[PDB]
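For the sake of clarity, the format in which proteins appear in this thesis is described at this point. The record quoted next illustrates the convention:

___
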Amino acid sequence: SMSYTWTGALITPCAAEESKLPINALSNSLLRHHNMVYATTSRSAGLRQKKVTFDRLQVLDDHYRDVLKEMKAKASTVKAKLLSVEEACKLTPPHSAKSKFGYGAKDVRNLSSKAVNHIHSVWKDLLEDTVTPIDTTIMAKNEVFCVQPEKGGRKPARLIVFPDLGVRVCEKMALYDVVSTLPQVVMGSSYGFQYSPGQRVEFLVNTWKSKKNPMGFSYDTRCFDSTVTENDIRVEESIYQCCDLAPEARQAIKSLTERLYIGGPLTNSKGQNCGYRRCRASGVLTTSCGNTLTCYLKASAACRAAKLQDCTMLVNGDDLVVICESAGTQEDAASLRVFTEAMTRYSAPPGDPPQPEYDLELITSCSSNVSVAHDASGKRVYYLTRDPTTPLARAAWETARHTPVNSWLGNIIMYAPTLWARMILMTHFFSILLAQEQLEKALDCQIYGACYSIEPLDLPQIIERLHGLSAFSLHSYSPGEINRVASCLRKLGVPPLRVWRHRARSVRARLLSQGGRAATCGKYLFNWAVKTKLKLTPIPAASLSGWFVAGYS
């Protein structure tokens, strides 16, 4: 079947959408080449439509059924329960797209008659009807990037697809528990979202260490969402049903599967119809857990198609890395050849072919990689890092134009130990946030898809729990890493690190001299700036499990 069928309708914007950096006094403090920074909008939705449209054929194997059955046996070990309306409404962000039925996000949280009444309606209907396609809306995502390395290249918007608020609350009722409990049990240590960035590194390095002759590769599957078949999504449902669920949840899961998960009509912002969907929708509840379960099953069965050795994978939605024994260069290459062939048979062809790696550091996964540095006591320390171009460009943007759900807080959080986040990010927002008396204003940001309410003055506490005190003292960064950042600074026109050194000297003083919480941030986050460093003692005001339970984008 074809991932999609399009009528003629243009995907339409509902909000005014900006695509050129909203250039600002403050925005210039950070970045200077704002013309390289842009945002995806509707205008490009069409380009995307073509790259995402094709036919999916699937030849399912014994290796595939064997793995599926093993996964059902684990999943059949799960008892999940439907979440009462109230709880369901609770999990709803006060930023969600309003219902086309009058009530918006808040009423959903306040337990309003219009809200809880419609919700009870979708539900009554979800149970009553199990075949009528359910409407979904489709839009061009607006997120910022930096123009392709090569002068030109610009990425077309991403197309999100989501049902109505009422369906969403219902998704929560019947699937939230299942979707945040079952993955870990089915996939074990391979379930990426159970790991904090720190534990993710501990597991890659360890996995790598436990291998006599280590070899690993990432697998970049092209538009994973567009390769998911109805079969995949149906195969999905049966795993969930292997759970011990209330009878009303079972009928809920069967229903949403045939009505929305499997596919359905595509309506734009202006009520018109754009085409039909037969792959995975990006805005549903099961999309994260579904892609993770599906990528795992295909990758597992695909590993058996070759590797007569010891595979170990880490799976995050569509992102996948696997570390195994080596049997030589030329042989290992042909191994990834077979692996890719099986993956394509399962309908998960690669964007970029898989390349065997022998330098753990060069294995990037989840748009990031593992690198080495040294702490206070000079002991080697492995940390999670990545090209900083996007966080930076997005960083600049969110400083020019107020964004309710930012990326910078999350980047600092998830990437605190690195050199770009420590020197560039922390330095810049503390001074900015300080200037306007915002430090104590908790901002929203998203960790693994879920959005959280984090206070920036809590950073040291958070940073220490997630990465360890070492995070406040890394210093002998790898030449590979220094050159990435340093190259990205020239490109974006960000000021030189040497300059951030002295910039940070300043902010730290203003922070210290404020006493209390502001003082701790200044001393811990910016000790790397001062010349005569002080000896950091573990932070007492700190002693984050839920954050890394499951993926929810």
DSSP finds 20 helices and 16 strands in the chain. The chain has four domains: 1-55+133-163+263-278, 56-132+164-191+229-262+279-285, 192-228+286-368, 369-553. The CA atoms of residues 93 and 517 lie 28 Å apart.
